[PDB]
Amino acid sequence: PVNPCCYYPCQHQGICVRFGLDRYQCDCTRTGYSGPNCTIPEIWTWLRTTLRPSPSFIHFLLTHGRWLWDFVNATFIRDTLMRLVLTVRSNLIPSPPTYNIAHDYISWESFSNVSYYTRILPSVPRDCPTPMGTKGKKQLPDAEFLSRRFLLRRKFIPDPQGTNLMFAFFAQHFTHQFFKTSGKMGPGFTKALGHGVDLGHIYGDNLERQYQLRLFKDGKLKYQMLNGEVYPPSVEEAPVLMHYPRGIPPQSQMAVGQEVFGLLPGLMLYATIWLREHNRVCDLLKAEHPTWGDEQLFQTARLILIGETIKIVIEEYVQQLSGYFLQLKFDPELLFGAQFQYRNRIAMEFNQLYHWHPLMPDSFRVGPQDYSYEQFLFNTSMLVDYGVEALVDAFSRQPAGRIGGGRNIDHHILHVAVDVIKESRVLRLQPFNEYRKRFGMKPYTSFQELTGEKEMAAELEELYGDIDALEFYPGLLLEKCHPNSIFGESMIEMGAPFSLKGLLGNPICSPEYWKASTFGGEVGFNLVKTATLKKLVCLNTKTCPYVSFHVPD
Amino acid sequence: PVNPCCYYPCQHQGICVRFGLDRYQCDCTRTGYSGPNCTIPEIWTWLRTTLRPSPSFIHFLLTHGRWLWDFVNATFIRDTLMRLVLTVRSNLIPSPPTYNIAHDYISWESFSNVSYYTRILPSVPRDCPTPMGTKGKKQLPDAEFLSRRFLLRRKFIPDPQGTNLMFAFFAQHFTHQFFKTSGKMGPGFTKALGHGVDLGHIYGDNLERQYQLRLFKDGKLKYQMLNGEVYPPSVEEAPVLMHYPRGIPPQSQMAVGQEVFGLLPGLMLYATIWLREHNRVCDLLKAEHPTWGDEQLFQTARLILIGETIKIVIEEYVQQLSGYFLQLKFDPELLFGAQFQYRNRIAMEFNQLYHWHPLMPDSFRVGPQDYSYEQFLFNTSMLVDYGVEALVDAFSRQPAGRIGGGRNIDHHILHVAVDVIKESRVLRLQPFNEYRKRFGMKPYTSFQELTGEKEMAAELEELYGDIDALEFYPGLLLEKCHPNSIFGESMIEMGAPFSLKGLLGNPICSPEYWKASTFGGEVGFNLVKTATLKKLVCLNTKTCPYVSFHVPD
Numbered sequence A, B: 001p002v003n004p005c006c007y008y009p010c011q012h013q014g015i016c017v018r019f020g021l022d023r024y025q026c027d028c029t030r031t032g033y034s035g036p037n038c039t040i041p042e043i044w045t046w047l048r049t050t051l052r053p054s055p056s057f058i059h060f061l062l063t064h065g066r067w068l069w070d071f072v073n074a075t076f077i078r079d080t081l082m083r084l085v086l087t088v089r090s091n092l093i094p095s096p097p098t099y100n101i102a103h104d105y106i107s108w109e110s111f112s113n114v115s116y117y118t119r120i121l122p123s124v125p126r127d128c129p130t131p132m133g134t135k136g137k138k139q140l141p142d143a144e145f146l147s148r149r150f151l152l153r154r155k156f157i158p159d160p161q162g163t164n165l166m167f168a169f170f171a172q173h174f175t176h177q178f179f180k181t182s183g184k185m186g187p188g189f190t191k192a193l194g195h196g197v198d199l200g201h202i203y204g205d206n207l208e209r210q211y212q213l214r215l216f217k218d219g220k221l222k223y224q225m226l227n228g229e230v231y232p233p234s235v236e237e238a239p240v241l242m243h244y245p246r247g248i249p250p251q252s253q254m255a256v257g258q259e260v261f262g263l264l265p266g267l268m269l270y271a272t273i274w275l276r277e278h279n280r281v282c283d284l285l286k287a288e289h290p291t292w293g294d295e296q297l298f299q300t301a302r303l304i305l306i307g308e309t310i311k312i313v314i315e316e317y318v319q320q321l322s323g324y325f326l327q328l329k330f331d332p333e334l335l336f337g338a339q340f341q342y343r344n345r346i347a348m349e350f351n352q353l354y355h356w357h358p359l360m361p362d363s364f365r366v367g368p369q370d371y372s373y374e375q376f377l378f379n380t381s382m383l384v385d386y387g388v389e390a391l392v393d394a395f396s397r398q399p400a401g402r403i404g405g406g407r408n409i410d411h412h413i414l415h416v417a418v419d420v421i422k423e424s425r426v427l428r429l430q431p432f433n434e435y436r437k438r439f440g441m442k443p444y445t446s447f448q449e450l451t452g453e454k455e456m457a458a459e460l461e462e463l464y465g466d467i468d469a470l471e472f473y474p475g476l477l478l479e480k481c482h483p484n485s486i487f488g489e490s491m492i493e494m495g496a497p498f499s500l501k502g503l504l505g506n507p508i509c510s511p512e513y514w515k516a517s518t519f520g521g522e523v524g525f526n527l528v529k530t531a532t533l534k535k536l537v538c539l540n541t542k543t544c545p546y547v548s549f550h551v552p553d
């Protein structure tokens, strides 16, 4: 007897539950609807859903009124929107968290075992007809094929939005503090507990590793002068795990906090920048608090980075991405009047979704030189040869690639893409259209509609046989982008919620923590309140190069 | 130069912070006050603090209007108060949590290292003149002396409030799921992570131990028929740690979830009762969901106990304790309109405070027999010899001891008391009066005032030299009780906040979780909504004995 929940009869976030041998029931509790499948709108929901404009429309206003916006920007109407932006977006992420790779239901285990990534939608029942549930073919497209055929870059397509490489890496770096899938435990698990912006990719993810990195003096971190400039320490001083290739594990084999940060200069660059910051903070703190110990100078300075980070990530990172005229803003107080849980738990869908590998170029331009992946990957001196000033200047100038539209992932890393598709299936993530709903959108009625064109569209149907069958990662990357956008609708509408629920759900953002005493002094609080990419750099370098999340000119 | 924060210059929860070599500053942020030490009430605080009646007064109304209360009880005015009761009481507990045994400031470490118990007030600076800070003698009273002289029971003083032993144990049992100080790590640390009502004293506190206890079939737990009645399994089947004395580790050496539950029949009794429940729940669930696996039948049934527990603990446990005419009530929805964090973290002060050892009798009456501690402690067959029905009936009839008033802890366990006093000092908990403030009360101006009498009072002063110097545990137990109360003012006013913040801050209490689907079915939800002590027993026994949290007649 077919598992009814295989059809996903419940609507609007109604919980599907098997009763007896062949029946089911939806728990439409607090879903705003009632009825067998949560299909009958309560008096207000009805009002709500009739007056609610399309997401497509909002993205429009947000990206057009270049006069009305400068006005809105200069007035309170700004925080109003920001506050609105937040609350509404974050309301879509269950918290306390729901299910994981092991439980398609609420459980104490799911709640407390920080190891499991968490999922938004349950998984595709292990007993459903098709791999996606009801519709599709008894076999999903060969992921190796799908990759090359639709995600493989032909000619490099740059981000119309002007994004650069200085951004591309910051992105990669930044995301690796919460995305750390444990190979040992397998997909659906993570080493990066904490699940947020704890910078456990600087201070490592365990107390020891931290201690191995901590110079237990002046709250500072270990480091080593090369060329007269500051850099991270090598394992010989910072005796901690890494993944540098078997070759020269002594010198140039720097310790950082994120195991894999030796594998690319980009990551290491930032690693250096932050470390040089932390210690910089300590120098400031210690002058304000001579009577202070080490443990303090450390923890306090930490929080000052968990702040600075959350600030730049919002008023600069997401700003660029958005393409909004509305000037996003980070002010924890905007939620002090709302019902918000200051707690996060990274999800698998969020993980998948953030696989923006196509941002990567073809080669890497550094002034006149032009390193190829071979010269770049695992290189180990570019950083010290060239220098932060110079390297940053070089990334802040080379365009990054459009993330959506399809076919723009360089071939070298195209393997990642395939794995995600393979992993997803292991994870048993519901179909693209299913996630469209859960994130307040309408399911696409055809590939022709999904993709703005007709070619891929037609061929994809030939493959999945039914648009519903379509999968998560592929749909996201193969969806048509908003005009001149770095990517399409589904990315923003599924990303921002995960993205903000996580940014603001950081304890330091709570009323309890958001005090100038938590950053010991007013000086600390300001560093947080006035952080900038331009300052995260030029305040830790000899000279001030060009740095931004977008190309100049 | 004396560490200024040694005087506790900041008021109303203002954070004290050292600046330079000899100065300090208070962070009166969101404290309702402003000024050098948070001593100048904002316009409303002033209104608030002038119109706010004394706690002594409230306890009065709550304990007198036996007509107006039956009326309030029969109307909505009930939930209004309940909601009021909650929110206000819970607002006094910082969340996300603040400090721990290692940090007297906010830190990422403090936030995430679930191992550290957390503290409400920072600790007494390791560089202050007196052990308590400013006032007192360079040496605290000899804890062994203090014990015998003021906490040692002379003549057994029963709880005027009518409390019985059926309650005394439930209490002990129940509290040991969140109070588990790790001897290895020392004071200020805990094995019981989760920090709440997760029943990790039934299902143990680690996945393995759980699995060793789990009968991986029908979601049920292992057990063994003795006399035809159900009991927990012995290590031989449930190969898990315990602490039964080196003697007969095979039979009668039952596994439970809480290492130390073999050490007293009382604890084991309850252990049996709950287990017999869980499996009982499973039987109900499995009939409603034949198509269900084991992992589910398990987790679901669990939550149904995390519910039932939180229900009884509130509408019966705290009810008895309170002595209120207001009929306390458990309905998670009452907070769905408030700003509440569904997260808890047990504190050291809460731990200390809950050391209600004087509830314990002199001997233990069981029908005509009358076991003494020697026959009772570590006994190992009383339970199976006598039986749940009978044993419960026997506890529900023997009075428990008044908790406050001083001098009423039986001699056998009087050692615990001394340790707490010794531990506290290791912990460096601020003075009694200091905690009085933090919990919205006025500091006592004399021992004569603390204690309703004159004898102890006079002698205690001779000891501490200054009422301020007075300590936490002693003050709590030596404070005069409200007339006919089981204990005094400070206990309720410091306990309820910790107690409720914890009860309601349970994830299952959130809007997200509080659905009938989380307890799979309506049947589950009702078991939670209608749990009773009388039912936790008589629905898992052959006959229905006398059971209540208070003596009959």
Ligand SMILES: *[C@@H]1O[C@H](CO)[C@@H](O[C@@H]2O[C@H](CO)[C@@H](O[C@@H]3O[C@H](CO[C@@H]4O[C@H](CO)[C@@H](O)[C@H](O[C@H]5O[C@H](CO)[C@@H](O)[C@H](O)[C@@H]5O)[C@@H]4O)[C@@H](O)[C@H](O)[C@@H]3O)[C@H](O)[C@H]2NC(C)=O)[C@H](O)[C@H]1NC(C)=O
Binding pocket: A102, A113, A115, A116, A184, A185, B206, B207, B208, B211, B212, B239, B240
């Ligand atoms: C978060 O959640 C993950 C799980 O999803 C946790 O990691 C996993 O943890 C489990 C259990 O700790 C582990 O178990 C695997 O299952 C094997 C099966 O074990 C056998 O079958 C039962 C189960 O107990 C027993 O009856 C068997 O008999 C044994 O009984 C004796 C009693 O002392 C044993 O001493 C003797 O060995 C005997 O055989 C037997 O145990 C288990 O044996 C095997 O070790 C295996 O590991 C998973 O492998 C863990 N790993 C993962 C990623 O799944 C993780 O710990 C959780 N995080 C936290 C912090 O809680």
Ligand SMILES: *[C@@H]1O[C@H](CO)[C@@H](O[C@@H]2O[C@H](CO)[C@@H](O[C@@H]3O[C@H](CO[C@@H]4O[C@H](CO)[C@@H](O)[C@H](O[C@H]5O[C@H](CO)[C@@H](O)[C@H](O)[C@@H]5O)[C@@H]4O)[C@@H](O)[C@H](O)[C@@H]3O)[C@H](O)[C@H]2NC(C)=O)[C@H](O)[C@H]1NC(C)=O
Binding pocket: A206, A207, A208, A211, A212, A239, A240, B102, B113, B115, B116, B184, B185
């Ligand atoms: C919650 O918080 C508690 C701490 O409050 C955690 O438990 C404690 O964890 C610490 C660190 O893991 C542990 O450390 C103790 O300190 C000893 C000092 O170590 C030496 O001094 C420094 C510190 O790293 C090093 O420079 C020394 O040199 C070493 O460097 C080599 C590098 O590989 C080493 O291999 C070699 O040994 C060399 O000596 C040296 O390490 C430490 O050595 C000792 O082991 C000791 O344990 C505490 O003891 C832990 N226990 C407690 C209760 O305090 C707990 O883990 C946290 N919980 C979680 C989950 O995070």
Ligand code: COH
Binding pocket: A168, A169, A171, A172, A175, A176, A179, A180, A181, A264, A351, A354, A355, A356, A357, A359, A360, A413, A415, A416, A417, A419, A420
């Ligand atoms: C938007 C962020 C971002 C960027 C710019 C990026 C850029 C690059 C890059 C360019 C120099 C290379 C060679 C790689 C190479 C890899 N990446 Co990423 N990755 C990124 C986010 C991720 C994530 C997320 C994972 C999955 C594992 C995890 O961390 O949980 C990942 C995994 C991988 C893996 C392991 C297998 C797999 O999961 O498919 C390889 C190899 N990569 N990555």
Ligand code: COH
Binding pocket: B168, B169, B171, B172, B175, B176, B179, B180, B181, B264, B351, B354, B355, B356, B357, B359, B360, B413, B415, B416, B417, B419, B420
């Ligand atoms: C109100 C609950 C309660 C009760 C009724 C109770 C009843 C009894 C009892 C009567 C039969 C005996 C013989 C003991 C004996 C002990 N108890 Co308690 N204890 C209780 C709550 C605690 C707590 C809390 C601790 C501290 C350790 C922990 O669990 O964190 C404790 C600790 C102890 C210790 C270890 C040393 C110490 O911390 O002082 C002994 C021995 N006991 N206890």
Ligand SMILES: *[C@@H]1O[C@H](CO)[C@@H](O[C@@H]2O[C@H](CO)[C@@H](O)[C@H](O)[C@H]2NC(C)=O)[C@H](O)[C@H]1NC(C)=O
Binding pocket: A369, A374, A375, A376, A378, A379, A380, A381, A382, A383, A385, A386
């Ligand atoms: C790693 O990067 C360095 C640059 O820091 C590479 O060396 C440069 O190579 C180019 C041509 O490939 C020369 O024209 C530059 O003069 C070199 N820089 C210097 C002074 O060394 C190096 O080849 C890279 N190694 C790898 C792994 O390919």
Ligand SMILES: *[C@@H]1O[C@H](CO)[C@@H](O[C@@H]2O[C@H](CO)[C@@H](O)[C@H](O)[C@H]2NC(C)=O)[C@H](O)[C@H]1NC(C)=O
Binding pocket: B369, B374, B375, B376, B378, B379, B380, B381, B382, B383, B385, B386
């Ligand atoms: C443990 O408890 C049992 C009761 O279950 C004790 O045995 C009883 O002892 C009394 C007198 O002490 C006798 O009058 C009862 O008849 C006994 N019950 C039976 C039938 O065994 C036993 O003595 C206790 N053991 C310890 C540790 O003292």
Ligand SMILES: *[C@@H]1O[C@H](CO)[C@@H](O[C@H]2O[C@H](CO)[C@@H](O)[C@H](O)[C@H]2NC(C)=O)[C@H](O)[C@H]1NC(C)=O
Binding pocket: A004, A007, A008, A009, A010, A035, A036, A037, A039
């Ligand atoms: C609720 O969801 C079910 C599940 O798809 C809907 O479908 C069932 O009933 C339909 C009405 O005739 C049939 O077309 C389907 O065969 C049948 N399928 C299943 C899985 O039971 C049901 O109609 C929905 N009800 C509402 C209110 O739309």
Ligand SMILES: *[C@@H]1O[C@H](CO)[C@@H](O[C@H]2O[C@H](CO)[C@@H](O)[C@H](O)[C@H]2NC(C)=O)[C@H](O)[C@H]1NC(C)=O
Binding pocket: B004, B007, B008, B009, B010, B035, B036, B037, B039
């Ligand atoms: C704020 O707290 C300090 C700390 O006790 C108060 O005391 C300081 O100033 C007093 C005023 O003369 C002196 O009596 C104390 O010697 C001095 N002690 C310290 C620790 O500095 C201070 O007066 C308080 N201010 C207010 C507004 O009451």
Ligand SMILES: CCCCC/C=C\C/C=C\CCCCCCCC(=O)O
Binding pocket: A085, A089, A178, A195, A196, A197, A313, A318, A321, A322, A491, A492, A495, A496, A497, A498, A499, A500, A502, A503
């Ligand atoms: C969990 C830590 C933070 C993780 C997220 C960080 C960056 C996320 C990347 C992209 C987010 C969505 C992109 C579009 C933003 C739209 C903003 C809005 O319209 O609201």
Ligand SMILES: CCCCC/C=C\C/C=C\CCCCCCCC(=O)O
Binding pocket: B085, B089, B178, B195, B196, B197, B313, B318, B321, B322, B491, B492, B495, B496, B497, B498, B499, B500, B502, B503
């Ligand atoms: C953390 C899990 C729950 C821990 C607490 C359980 C029981 C606590 C014991 C006593 C609490 C305070 C006693 C007085 C109650 C007054 C109620 C009120 O006036 O508000």
Ligand SMILES: CCCCCCCCO[C@@H]1O[C@H](CO)[C@@H](O)[C@H](O)[C@H]1O
Binding pocket: A054, A055, A056, A058, A059, A061, A062, A081, A084, A085, A088, A089, A440, A493
């Ligand atoms: C026009 C923008 C007004 C201020 C922000 C309103 C909320 C924006 O945020 C998001 O907008 C999406 C539409 O694109 C909706 O689908 C989301 O539910 C909503 O949270």
Ligand SMILES: CCCCCCCCO[C@@H]1O[C@H](CO)[C@@H](O)[C@H](O)[C@H]1O
Binding pocket: A032, A052, A053, A084, A088, A091, A092, A439, A440
């Ligand atoms: C500010 C102008 C646009 C506002 C309308 C955004 C659409 C409302 O957003 C909806 O809010 C519900 C909250 O009850 C969520 O449960 C829904 O999933 C979400 O789509």
Ligand SMILES: CCCCCCCCO[C@@H]1O[C@H](CO)[C@@H](O)[C@H](O)[C@H]1O
Binding pocket: B054, B055, B056, B058, B059, B061, B062, B081, B084, B085, B088, B089, B440, B493
């Ligand atoms: C008279 C009771 C009215 C309904 C409950 C009001 C809040 C009760 O709760 C508590 O009462 C104490 C007084 O004893 C106060 O000190 C606490 O701050 C308050 O939270």
Ligand SMILES: CCCCCCCCO[C@@H]1O[C@H](CO)[C@@H](O)[C@H](O)[C@H]1O
Binding pocket: B032, B052, B053, B084, B088, B091, B092, B439, B440
């Ligand atoms: C319902 C009748 C009694 C209500 C008055 C209770 C006294 C108010 O309670 C106060 O509330 C503050 C919230 O801003 C807390 O910070 C204080 O610590 C607390 O004592």
Ligand SMILES: OC[C@H]1O[C@@H](O)[C@H](O)[C@@H](O)[C@@H]1O
Binding pocket: A054, A056, A057, A060
């Ligand atoms: O994208 C769909 C369209 O929705 C409409 O509401 C807007 O006016 C258009 O600007 C937008 O392109």
Ligand SMILES: OC[C@H]1O[C@@H](O)[C@H](O)[C@@H](O)[C@@H]1O
Binding pocket: B054, B056, B057, B060
């Ligand atoms: O306890 C102090 C006293 O406070 C007064 O407000 C009440 O009317 C008394 O009943 C109470 O005993």
